[PDB]
Design an enzyme around this catalytic site. Structure first.
Site, PDB file in Angstrom:
ATOM      1  N   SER A   1       1.426  -5.869  -1.537  1.00 33.43           N
ATOM      2  CA  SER A   1       2.047  -6.775  -0.500  1.00 33.43           C
ATOM      3  C   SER A   1       1.456  -7.913  -0.746  1.00 33.43           C
ATOM      4  O   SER A   1       0.630  -8.092  -1.194  1.00 33.43           O
ATOM      5  CB  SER A   1       1.550  -6.103   1.121  1.00 33.43           C
ATOM      6  OG  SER A   1       1.866  -7.026   1.943  1.00 33.43           O
TER       7      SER A   1
ATOM      8  N   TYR B   1      -4.398  -1.444   6.471  1.00 38.82           N
ATOM      9  CA  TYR B   1      -3.287  -1.685   5.689  1.00 38.82           C
ATOM     10  C   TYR B   1      -3.895  -2.820   4.772  1.00 38.82           C
ATOM     11  O   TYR B   1      -3.586  -2.724   3.308  1.00 38.82           O
ATOM     12  CB  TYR B   1      -2.303  -2.360   6.662  1.00 38.82           C
ATOM     13  CG  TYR B   1      -0.804  -2.707   5.808  1.00 38.82           C
ATOM     14  CD1 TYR B   1       0.035  -1.620   5.607  1.00 38.82           C
ATOM     15  CD2 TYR B   1      -0.704  -3.957   5.183  1.00 38.82           C
ATOM     16  CE1 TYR B   1       1.234  -1.721   4.938  1.00 38.82           C
ATOM     17  CE2 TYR B   1       0.746  -4.110   4.597  1.00 38.82           C
ATOM     18  CZ  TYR B   1       1.335  -3.042   4.484  1.00 38.82           C
ATOM     19  OH  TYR B   1       2.675  -3.355   3.829  1.00 38.82           O
TER      20      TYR B   1
ATOM     21  N   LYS C   1      -4.059  -2.494   0.680  1.00 39.81           N
ATOM     22  CA  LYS C   1      -3.280  -3.035  -0.185  1.00 39.81           C
ATOM     23  C   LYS C   1      -4.153  -3.893  -1.177  1.00 39.81           C
ATOM     24  O   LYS C   1      -3.462  -3.992  -2.465  1.00 39.81           O
ATOM     25  CB  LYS C   1      -2.168  -4.119   0.373  1.00 39.81           C
ATOM     26  CG  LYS C   1      -0.926  -3.064   1.396  1.00 39.81           C
ATOM     27  CD  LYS C   1      -0.400  -1.964   0.524  1.00 39.81           C
ATOM     28  CE  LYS C   1       0.956  -1.561   1.172  1.00 39.81           C
ATOM     29  NZ  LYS C   1       1.563  -0.288   0.522  1.00 39.81           N
TER      30      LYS C   1
END
Ligand SMILES: NC(=O)c1ccc[n+]([C@@H]2O[C@H](COP(=O)([O-])OP(=O)(O)OC[C@H]3O[C@@H](n4cnc5c(N)ncnc54)[C@H](O)[C@@H]3O)[C@@H](O)[C@H]2O)c1
Ligand SMILES: NC(=O)c1ccc[n+]([C@@H]2O[C@H](COP(=O)([O-])OP(=O)(O)OC[C@H]3O[C@@H](n4cnc5c(N)ncnc54)[C@H](O)[C@@H]3O)[C@@H](O)[C@H]2O)c1
Ligand SMILES: NC(=O)c1ccc[n+]([C@@H]2O[C@H](COP(=O)([O-])OP(=O)(O)OC[C@H]3O[C@@H](n4cnc5c(N)ncnc54)[C@H](O)[C@@H]3O)[C@@H](O)[C@H]2O)c1
Ligand SMILES: NC(=O)c1ccc[n+]([C@@H]2O[C@H](COP(=O)([O-])OP(=O)(O)OC[C@H]3O[C@@H](n4cnc5c(N)ncnc54)[C@H](O)[C@@H]3O)[C@@H](O)[C@H]2O)c1
Lengths: 249, 253, 253, 249
Positions: free
Chosen positions: C147, C160, C164
């Site tokens: 991401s 998250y 990532k």
């Protein structure tokens, strides 16, 4: 257990752009810590006002007329510092200006003047300083004044962002070349500081800070002192961003 | 003109992994600067040896049995520190281990244990500490022990490199979330330091461990403890969200 | 003079999370380029809908029930692909979810589930795939779905962003370990893409999601599938270890 | 389901340094993909040899005498391309040289020549190209040839590493300014490529690759084609490192 080191007694520093703003606070802070300081500026009158303050505050300093774009001026000014105080242990390459225009409108001579002050000034002062620091591998510290604009861009600042990115590269090469001569290099990367160079504040300038705070001259001078006085070469080649969360390095 | 800020008088710090190595020197250094220090470790006997050294030098400390992989142990140990010294101003999330194996041979159990210590420990200690720091927006400082391995890889260290990269992400989120509550976050990224984590590892120095330094020097525990004190005592939040690499030129950030 | 390589004839790919969104378009795109594709997902019915689309366009695919948090499910599903199509050349580790909460409110269970899907799934699928790819140094390609949140943070996405960031580290280690076996690794880093992960999220676009793009544009599933095909079909290992950000100028890498 | 795009039919590209090495492969690759290509070089003879190849291979090209350090030469050459082929859709700013010396020995005029070719060349060609691309917001692609030395240093390459770092900054500003005019910017960052510019190989040059492989001109030309033909602006402002694992970005 250990403690911070900040004594610069017996050291000699040259700070370019030291008549104003960030450079002036670094110079006054190094002098308070015991360094003899060369106040190198294109504005000799303003440089001597900084020297007057340092001397009245009990320190040692010398006003040096130096346009950092001029090879001869840089060489002559570094030699004056070494002739006056006996050597050069610390260089802070800080002189700078800002010229704002989008690329499609920017005059070529404005592009070249920006690179000459930020990049040629860094090269010329570095090279002059390390001819002294390399003698007998005595060594020394070279700090470049970068920016958050070393790491990311803003509109209408092409030559500034280009130059501040370039200073990372010059610092990284000096770290590798200087190591065998006990020379260490660093880049300090401030966010916006309310110097003369600096809804406009909160929604444009500080929009990408986490806390809507300016960086201060004392923030940068404390970091510059921590680095200059550090007892080992552990931070050689590093940049450190001081920006209230604008670009997290 | 200014000068360095070094005083932690009145502050309360929790340092995980403070029974040994980098964490022990950070804890002893904070106590010498005036902080009361929680010495949080799975090795309670070695944690008490850190406390004895701090007390012998005239400081205040408390040994806290804490497996940072356990939510209950983290929550209980942070609460014991707050009950004893009145609050928590500084968290140093530093506990860690190393497990070496290539990906194709690495036991899944070892992958999970590595992420639990480095990443779950960082989450659990951060969440427990900021529930105190957020009260009345008093604020505080959270420092994660990253690595050069936060920024680049080495062979045979997949979970370690994954975790140390992950700590940058957690730090960057906390810098954004914590700002309105006066909480600042940082990651310190050492190169090789001759602690027991590394001493055990050598039986290599010049052509593996120090090959990408500019000067063939180890980082030292005092390098890292001085940086940890500079950050914890800093008078503004200017370094929030930042990582600082302390590696003798191995990965120039 | 040269030209783009686009042909995956004879290749076998496994794409996790291929029942939906970015993973579905990568899988359909690989099959159109000639690859046989394992459609690995926890949603077997939606996985079979991807297979039906691939077959309707004249391609080969297999629906594989795979919870990427389970070692047994990953190992069994990779073995089913190899038994069916004869090997595995390409892994795309893409399965993922989003859970939004500030650190001080986030359930530890949610932190662990996020790391299990994004990080344990990446480890387990990588290890299972490279045991095949390393045989006779045949080699292959491993792509992780990162991401912009591999490189910077947003509010309320701690696990998250941690995960990532972690995937960069795992990719960088695999690039070093895999080289002697002709295995290359990459991370693709999209900005916001209007999949169901994001559609669910909106009930925001201009002043949160796209605020740091230069042009106020979403990334698209076809942007990411074209980049995934460019990498998987590339004729040399020149991009091994790299991340490539595809975000309309949100984080300039 | 989708597929790669690589058609440049109806597009016009200018490639600087296109008489040799990386630039020549990019130019020949763009011409194979249907672009009309300006072969801009200081070596006009070598530029016309590239044009001769492109034309014999069924493409369209024009030899342009251009020292990219000269404002007038850059402006005149871009105008010739636009007068011949009707516009400019793609610029590849690639011309470069290498000058090796440690900072303490490096001649100032060698430092300045390096920045003039790498940085002034990028500014001048960008500005000239975007005066055309910005008209009616038609837009276009600007690619800079960076290096792994955009991201890290090597010994004895101060001005090169400084300039290649600086190109990231210029690219990042253009991405922000160009967006409203449909202009996208990129930096390609090769590792060592066996062009004329290039135990020495395996223990020095390729030591920090994972696989002891050179980067190839075709690697870089494929990436340049992928970017130039890409159907959306999704990669604007990005650098992409193509180095066999030397600096993992
Ligand atoms: N103020 C900010 O927000 C900020 C943020 C990041 C970085 N910087 C950098 O910090 C440095 C100092 O900036 P400041 O804000 O203190 O600016 P300032 O204008 O207060 O001080 C700059 C000084 O440099 C001198 N100078 C200018 N051209 C010179 C030349 N050719 N030779 C020698 N001296 C010259 C000026 O006379 C002045 O005394 C600059 O490099 C700037 O790019 C500033
Ligand atoms: N030594 C190095 O070269 C180096 C370099 C970079 C980063 N680091 C990091 O520095 C940190 C400290 O490492 P060190 O070198 O001082 O190692 P060390 O082994 O000397 O100290 C680690 C401490 O962590 C404790 N610990 C381990 N698991 C724990 C758990 N579950 N809960 C609580 N405590 C636990 C150990 O008991 C020990 O006292 C680690 O996060 C490590 O990854 C070390
Ligand atoms: N959409 C975005 O804006 C965006 C941006 C950057 C990165 N990403 C990443 O792209 C990847 C794909 O996301 P998407 O937007 O296509 O989402 P999506 O919800 O459309 O697809 C995700 C798929 O993963 C599957 N999945 C979830 N948990 C699983 C598990 N345990 N095992 C196997 N399959 C599982 C789901 O069933 C679903 O089919 C994710 O890793 C996500 O983090 C998305
Ligand atoms: N070869 C490598 O290993 C490598 C790796 C990374 C980046 N690069 C970069 O790739 C670019 C191309 O290098 P190359 O290896 O193909 O070199 P090359 O020597 O084969 O080609 C360079 C070309 O630029 C031309 N040129 C030089 N000065 C010029 C000027 N002032 N104006 C116009 N044209 C001029 C030369 O005549 C020549 O045709 C350079 O920017 C270089 O820095 C090269």
């Amino acid at each position: 257990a250990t403690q911070l080191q900040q004594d610069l007694t017996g050291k000699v520093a040259l700070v370019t752009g030291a008549a104003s703003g960030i450079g002036r606070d670094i110079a006054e802070t190094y002098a308070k810590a015991g360094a003899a300081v060369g106040i190198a500026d294109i504005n000799l009158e303003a440089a001597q006002k900084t020297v007057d303050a340092i001397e009245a505050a009990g320190g040692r300093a010398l006003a040096i007329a130096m346009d950092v774009t001029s090879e001869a001026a840089v060489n002559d000014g570094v030699q004056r510092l070494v002739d006056t105080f006996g050597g050069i242990d610390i260089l802070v390459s800080n002189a700078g200006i800002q010229i704002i225009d989008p690329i499609h409108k920017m005059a070529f001579e404005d592009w070249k003047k920006m690179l000459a002050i930020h990049l040629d000034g860094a090269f010329l002062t570095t090279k002059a300083a390390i001819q002294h620091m390399y003698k007998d591998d005595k060594g020394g510290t070279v700090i470049y004044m970068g920016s958050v604009h070393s790491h990311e861009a803003s509109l209408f600042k092409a030559p500034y962002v280009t130059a501040k990115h370039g200073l990372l590269g010059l610092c990284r090469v000096l770290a590798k070349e200087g190591a065998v001569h006990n020379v260490r290099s660093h880049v300090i990367c401030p966010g916006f500081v309310k110097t003369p160079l600096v809804s406009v504040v909160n929604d444009i300038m500080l929009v990408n800070t986490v806390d809507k705070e300016f960086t201060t001259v004392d923030d940068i001078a404390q970091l510059a002192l921590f680095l200059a006085a550090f007892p080992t070469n552990v931070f050689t080649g590093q940049s450190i961003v001081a920006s209230h969360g604008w670009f997290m390095n």
